[PDB]
Design a protein around this ligand. Structure first.
Ligand SMILES: Nc1ncnc2c1ncn2[C@@H]1O[C@H](COP(=O)(O)OP(=O)(O)NP(=O)(O)O)[C@@H](O)[C@H]1O
Ligand SMILES: Nc1ncnc2c1ncn2[C@@H]1O[C@H](COP(=O)(O)OP(=O)(O)NP(=O)(O)O)[C@@H](O)[C@H]1O
Lengths: 354, 364
């Protein structure tokens, strides 16, 4: 029962640090940047995840700065943050105290994959809808995640709530300002990134989201490959060879233009026969060569594939009610306010003033 | 646009007869018959089959790739001018009509090699064992020879990795294969930075450089050597940033100048300032110091700072191979290691004074 007490700063609000005590620490994750532990807050008994990262004393943490300003039901909440010293030297660590979430889309999808089972479409709808809401929210602040993948999509299986995490690659994209093309994990990288573009936009997150949707429908990654060339060939096999204008749209630079002219592969033949046509249609609208041609996250949320979620009688397979899905804010709808007419169904959020 | 002839020699045995063009010799079409076909490899580009030559009974590999009627096959054009003991030989090639449409397939008939460095390394890794250093020395030496050879023609492989290194376990002979990404690099000409397999990509490729040189093959070979010594890839990562982080952990943060050497265009300069990781702390205890030294001279941020393949061959890590009494653990003789040609030595002829040991110069 070893208790650890620190003076941590609330993730949001005023910089008024308070004493926080926790126990039952244990490693629950890792990365090239740091370690993630689980712990229990002594006062509330609530479980949290503490992401520990080496902090450059001379500069401020971008991940922390971005997290401090986010407040959305589909994004993991930053409860507190504090600094601790790494005895190994005069090394200082930034500790992000976040809400603990038990699963990830990666693990859940792997279970169904192994059991040679398909993840029920109701879950594919729920998870993808919530992912798009989180993207609509961060994109409205000009912030691009840049690492959308199954492992960064936390899930609470019982409530079916999805929470986007890991803002370690996130960055506000400013039109005209160049950005590195080596972010984003293999399998989920937008083609313009593979082509080395540095003028990409937030739409790279939409391509990644589309790769996640296809993977949940297929049961395996849709564009695998150990090299960029292999990945591109897998993309070309499905989307067909990119037009000269399309290549120009992605990155009007890359020399190699030698690529087997393959006709677009009918999106319908890509997935199993049982696959809902709406899911396929949404997919074709996310995985587009021309970045500007892809649906925006808010438009994706309004897609017909998510119509069942807007049904007043929808329920979770475990009998519970669906989680929050319609508590949109002005900020979240800012890219296209008129969509509220579709996004907030007649029965949703009905509340009188007594 | 050619065709084949299928039949049944005897016992129902299916025999395929084709008319192929010699790989190296002059264009004298020859009739080739083979049986017992079976897939032994794959790639987004094609499929590799194993087949048995009807008369010699010899096994060969047939790499089948879709041919673009638009231009010539770069892989074939390159394979055709190569002749080295550490590079898989192209016996002949022929076209076959893909019964799927008006699609034509180019078939490269190669010498068949039973193993790959990838499979061998995995066997030891699984058993939580490590490949004896003598094999590491032999395989890496032969890989550097093959690179000195293709580089002497200005040809960069661009996909050096364990799966592209064929091996004959008994003779310990290594043959480089898969020239599907290979290209002659001409100074001033831009080249795509999305080639090469993750884990083996040089940092300048990760940074999106298009003005890279053949030294990217040297970085990759260095990753293979480190991997054979470690039992696992040295710079793993699902994203480029993760890979850069693993690299920085070992090499330390790249100076502003080193960054300029790889690619003078990329933005992100924001990367934790880690100190150089003692290479000796990177490998298991008792790892030969010479192996660690060679690794540090191959895995350098500044491309021009890396050893050339010929220089690598002359490194002291390979001194044991030049010993007159060296033999394979199975008591057998080592493969050909000193039959260097003028072409192969062109990059630095004087290195021959080290490369060709005294005993190899005996008249007899
Ligand atoms: N709030 C959390 N609750 C429970 N588990 C978490 C939480 N945050 C992170 N993890 C686990 O820790 C893993 C790594 O955390 P993450 O924020 O991704 O750090 P990172 O290693 O630097 N980034 P990356 O590895 O590139 O995804 C995740 O993929 C999760 O499985
Ligand atoms: N001559 C050969 N003898 C035996 N096996 C071979 C031979 N050539 C290739 N293979 C096997 O087939 C695999 C694929 O061959 P390869 O030439 O790499 O085709 P590819 O799949 O189109 N290229 P890539 O997948 O990008 O490495 C190799 O990694 C080997 O394991």
């Amino acid at each position: 029962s070893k208790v650890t007490t620190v003076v941590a700063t609330p993730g949001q609000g005023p910089d008024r640090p308070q004493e926080v005590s926790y126990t039952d620490t244990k490693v629950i994750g890792n990365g090239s940047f740091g370690v993630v532990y689980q712990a229990k807050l002594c006062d509330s008994g609530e479980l949290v995840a503490i992401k520990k990262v080496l902090q450059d004393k001379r500069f401020k943490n971008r991940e922390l700065q971005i997290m401090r300003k986010l407040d959305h039901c589909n994004i993991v909440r930053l409860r507190y943050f504090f600094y601790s010293s790494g005895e190994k030297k005069d090394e200082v660590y930034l500790n992000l105290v976040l809400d603990y979430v038990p699963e990830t889309v990666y693990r859940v999808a792997r279970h169904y994959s192994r059991a040679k089972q398909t993840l029920p479409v109701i879950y594919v709808k729920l998870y993808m809808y919530q992912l798009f809401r989180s993207l609509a929210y961060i994109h409205s602040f000009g912030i691009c995640h840049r690492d959308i993948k199954p492992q960064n999509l936390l899930l609470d299986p019982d409530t079916a709530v999805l929470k986007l995490c890991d803002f370690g690659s996130a960055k506000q994209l400013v039109r005209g300002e160049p950005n590195v093309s080596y972010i984003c994990s293999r399998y989920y990288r937008a083609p313009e990134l593979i082509f080395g573009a540095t003028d990409y936009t937030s739409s790279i997150d939409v391509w990644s989201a589309g790769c996640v949707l296809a993977e949940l429908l297929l049961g395996q990654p849709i564009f695998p490959g150990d090299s960029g060339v292999d990945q591109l060939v897998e993309i070309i096999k499905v989307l067909g060879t990119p037009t000269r204008e399309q290549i120009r749209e992605m990155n009007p630079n890359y020399t190699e233009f030698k690529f087997p002219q393959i006709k677009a592969h009918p999106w319908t033949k890509v997935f199993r026969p049982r696959t809902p046509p709406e899911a396929i249609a949404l997919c074709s609208r996310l995985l587009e060569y021309t970045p500007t041609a892809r649906l925006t996250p808010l438009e994706a949320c309004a897609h017909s594939f998510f119509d069942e979620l807007r049904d007043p009688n929808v329920k979770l397979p475990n009998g519970r009610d669906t989680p929050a899905l319609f508590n949109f804010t002005t900020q979240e709808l800012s890219s296209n306010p008129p969509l509220a007419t579709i996004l907030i169904p007649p029965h949703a959020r009905i509340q009188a003033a007594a």
